[PDB]
């Protein structure tokens, strides 16, 4: 039994190296009777003629495995495709030595394909590690629209989703298209200062020139790119201080040939014990069935720890890709590509030199540039946020407390519009109260300026399925905070699990619960049989798109509760209270903090039962906002000294 392997090369000289390497491999092994044989063929220009060349010689001979290399001149995924298809027809394993494209990782297209070199997509992994090293969280994924960009983005998103994080935004750059300036203009607005690029040489050069035009290469920014973006045309126009990376061996054909023949021989020896070896198809013509042993040969070849190779230990993952690697990190320091570290496979190891960031700084920059002018959204809640009309001169009535203290007021832009339906005019008013006083204290403590505006639709916000679609989208202050119109929510927003997945909540600044308001006392909580057996006799309702809606919708035990509620929800809390007092609605379920104040001030109404959902009000921010801790600390401090007691006494008597 003579086990023959084959190779398709280009240089006509590396085939002699492959013959030498296979001869050495034959000189060392368990058995020496298999008489390992080798054959080789040079590359052909025509792809169809190339595939026919694979069918002849290689396939015609009794070959067990095929190796394929790539000519030095970059031609991308064009040369190994025909041999991969032809050998995958018979499930004959094909080992790639220099190709880097991720299209060959898809086992649906290329069935029997393994590679000894990681693809371009795997680079994203090291980026994650770097993001762990420097604690960067806000990133932008500027990736091409081709398969490579989609694969890199998908892998990075998978890694990020394994952890608790998410990329700020991705930007699809269509290959070969000029004017990428729109994407850079969009990315300049965002808070993230870490730019990640995945594109070819021409695309990388184009985006580098466009970013130089937009001055996005200055101080504070961080650029992380791949191998294709620090070579060829890209390196010429690349801005200084970018951090790229490159594989250690990369193009050392001889190392990848020796390391491949060693593992192939080890695999052959390993599976030869079980025998049941089926001879190869012996020619494309005269056979239409796959080689039966082929699948098992590939399966045993994938799990083969050949830890004596030129390029280190060889191991393959579930998709037939070389598990580990070593990436050298490159910095463009004064037009020179200097090495500053080596990625062992799980952690980057910095040994010598110092990273020079693009702005010229010698100190690690944080990955965000939080602005000073802060847009803050708020809603109209009577005990917390009083909204009053401003006089014709642009400021509203001056007022003082009963004790004799000046009431601080700010200017806000609310939905006041004479036109019916939606708000069609944002006429300014003046806002004050508990939340605005807290906001003023917070802004004084944290040294930032603010612009306060009211929510567009008068709702707190729950995610709901968008019309003519199947996905759910947020609305209200929730939607405006997530979209970007507002940067912080200072309002009585109830903390709950649904909102905490997308919004970051500070420490609660007001503990409260949910209670029931009726006319001025035969209701005990939400467990009374009348409230468990809905009917026209006792009607109960809440505010649409609020925390109570979410609470009842997320309860399996209270489905009928929400079913009855859905028929009578109200636009706002104030109109619901007015309807209840006027004997148009029987019971109104709402927060204790507001309901108790309404019952105390306006009287003629009573709160019944004990609080059945204890929660707190919190300042809402975008996910992973850098200044969450600040605010939380301040809130805790306000609880400690005297501030929340004074705010309670002054506003909610």
């Amino acid at each position: 039994k003579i086990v023959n392997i084959g190779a398709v090369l280009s240089t006509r000289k590396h085939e002699q190296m492959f013959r030498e390497a296979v001869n050495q491999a034959n000189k060392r092994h368990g058995s020496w009777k298999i008489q390992l044989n080798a054959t080789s063929v040079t590359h052909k220009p025509n792809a169809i003629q190339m595939a026919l060349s694979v069918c002849e010689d290689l396939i015609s001979s009794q070959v067990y495995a095929i190796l394929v290399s790539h000519p030095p001149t970059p031609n991308d995924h064009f040369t190994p495709t025909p041999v991969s298809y032809t050998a995958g027809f018979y499930r004959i394993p094909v080992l790639g030595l220099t190709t880097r494209m991720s299209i060959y990782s898809d086992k649906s297209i290329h069935l029997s394909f393994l590679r000894t070199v990681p693809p371009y997509s795997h680079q994203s992994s090291v980026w994650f590690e770097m993001m762990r090293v420097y604690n960067w969280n806000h990133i932008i994924l500027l990736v091409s629209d081709d398969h490579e960009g989609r694969a890199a983005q998908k892998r990075l998103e998978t890694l990020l989703e394994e952890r608790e994080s998410k990329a700020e935004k991705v930007l699809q750059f269509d290959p070969g298209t000029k004017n990428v300036t729109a994407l850079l203009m969009e990315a300049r607005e965002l808070e993230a200062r870490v730019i990640i690029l995945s594109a070819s040489e021409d695309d990388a050069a184009t985006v580098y020139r466009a970013a130089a035009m937009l001055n996005m290469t200055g101080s504070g920014y961080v650029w992380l790119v791949g191998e294709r973006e620090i070579s060829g045309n890209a390196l010429r126009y690349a801005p200084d201080g970018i951090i790229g990376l490159q594989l250690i061996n990369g193009k050392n054909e001889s190392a990848h040939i020796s390391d491949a023949v060693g593992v192939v021989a080890q695999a052959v020896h390993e599976l030869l014990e079980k025998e049941n070896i089926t001879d190869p198809p012996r020619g494309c013509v005269g056979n239409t069935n796959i080689w039966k042993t082929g699948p098992l040969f590939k399966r045993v070849l994938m799990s083969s720890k050949y830890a004596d190779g030129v390029t280190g230990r060889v191991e393959f993952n579930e998709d037939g890709d070389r598990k580990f690697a070593n990436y050298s990190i490159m910095n463009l320091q004064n037009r020179k590509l200097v090495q500053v570290g080596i990625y062992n496979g799980t952690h980057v190891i910095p040994n010598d030199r110092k990273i020079i960031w693009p702005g010229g700084e010698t100190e690690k920059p944080r990955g965000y540039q939080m602005s000073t002018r802060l847009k803050i959204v708020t809603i109209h809640q009577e005990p917390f946020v009083y909204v009053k009309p401003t006089m014709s001169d642009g400021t509203c009535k001056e007022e003082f407390t009963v004790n004799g203290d000046p009431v601080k007021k700010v200017i806000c832009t609310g939905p006041n519009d004479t036109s019916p339906g939606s708000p069609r005019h944002t006429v300014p008013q003046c806002c004050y109260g508990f939340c605005i006083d807290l906001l003023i204290k917070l802004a004084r403590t944290m040294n930032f300026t603010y612009e306060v505006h009211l929510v567009a639709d008068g709702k707190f916000g729950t995610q709901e399925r968008v019309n003519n679609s199947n996905k759910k989208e947020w609305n209200g202050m929730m939607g405006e905070l997530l979209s970007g119109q507002a940067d912080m929510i200072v309002a009585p927003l109830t903390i709950n699990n649904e909102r905490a997945q997308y919004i970051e909540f500070s420490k609660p600044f007001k503990y409260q619960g949910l209670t029931i308001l009726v006319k001025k006392e035969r209701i005990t909580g939400i467990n009374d049989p009348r409230l468990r057996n809905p009917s026209d006799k006792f009607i109960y309702a809440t505010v649409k798109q609020s925390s109570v809606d979410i609470y009842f919708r997320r309860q399996v035990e209270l489905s009928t509760m929400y079913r009855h509620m859905e028929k009578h929800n109200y636009e706002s809390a104030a109109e619901a209270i007015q309807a209840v007092r006027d004997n148009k609605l029987h019971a109104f379920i709402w927060d204790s903090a507001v309901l108790e104040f309404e019952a105390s001030q306006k009287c003629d109404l009573v709160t019944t039962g004990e609080l059945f959902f204890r929660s707190g009000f919190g300042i809402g921010m975008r996910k992973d906002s850098p200044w969450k801790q600040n605010v939380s600390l301040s809130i805790l401090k306000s609880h400690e000294n005297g501030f929340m007691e004074d705010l309670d006494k002054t506003w909610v008597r």
Partner: protein, 200 residues
């Protein structure tokens, strides 16, 4: 699972023994589907109380299904599943002819024929990119054959078929336009695969 000709008999019976589900959606090739159904029969997973659904990958040459397939297996195919080879050839020829006719009536000239292996084109010619787009949106004999950019069929008239008592693949429902036309108001179950009776 880990199916295949012969393979590792174990580690499938143990896993299939503790799956507590009344309806199962399986994805596997024809031989793998046969092995999985045989193992499930040995695992007490077929018969009434267990409904199987598979894509076309499990179905092979629907003219005659293997005996290992359990009665009540449900799948979804295209409308042309019951057509003959000649009818399918006619439909493909009609698709190409209508695409060429649309190209001719748009540009006022017949489509340019292709070449051969020598002198590979490289960048797709604008004429090719227009003939392809014209070939994409084509409707023939009521049924629409619009092709997605990926190359498959978008919004086709799909039929949900199932294996009957007499082990013959027959249509059970249609899809047409986003609306299901099921001929069984209640899904039937049959005495098949009731060797221990307790499986009922």
């Amino acid at each position: 699972l880990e199916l295949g000709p012969g393979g590792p008999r174990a580690r499938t019976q143990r896993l299939l023994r503790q799956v507590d589900a009344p309806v199962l959606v399986a994805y596997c090739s024809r031989e793998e589907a046969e092995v999985l159904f045989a193992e499930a029969a040995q695992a007490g997973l077929v018969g009434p109380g267990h409904v199987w659904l598979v894509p076309n990958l499990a179905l092979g040459s629907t003219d005659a299904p293997p005996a290992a397939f359990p009665v009540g297996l449900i799948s979804v195919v295209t409308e042309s599943w019951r057509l003959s080879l000649r009818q399918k050839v006619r439909d493909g020829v009609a698709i190409l002819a209508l695409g060429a006719h649309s190209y001719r009536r748009q540009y006022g000239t017949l489509p340019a024929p292709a070449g051969d292996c020598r002198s590979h084109p490289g960048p797709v010619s604008p004429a090719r990119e227009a003939f392809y787009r014209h070939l994409l949106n084509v409707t023939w004999e009521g049924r629409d054959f619009s092709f997605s950019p990926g190359g498959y069929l978008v919004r086709p008239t799909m039929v949900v078929i199932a294996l009957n008592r007499h082990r013959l693949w027959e249509m059970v429902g249609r899809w047409d336009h986003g609306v299901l036309y099921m001929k069984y108001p209640v899904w039937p179950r049959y005495s098949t695969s009731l060797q221990p009776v307790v499986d009922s």
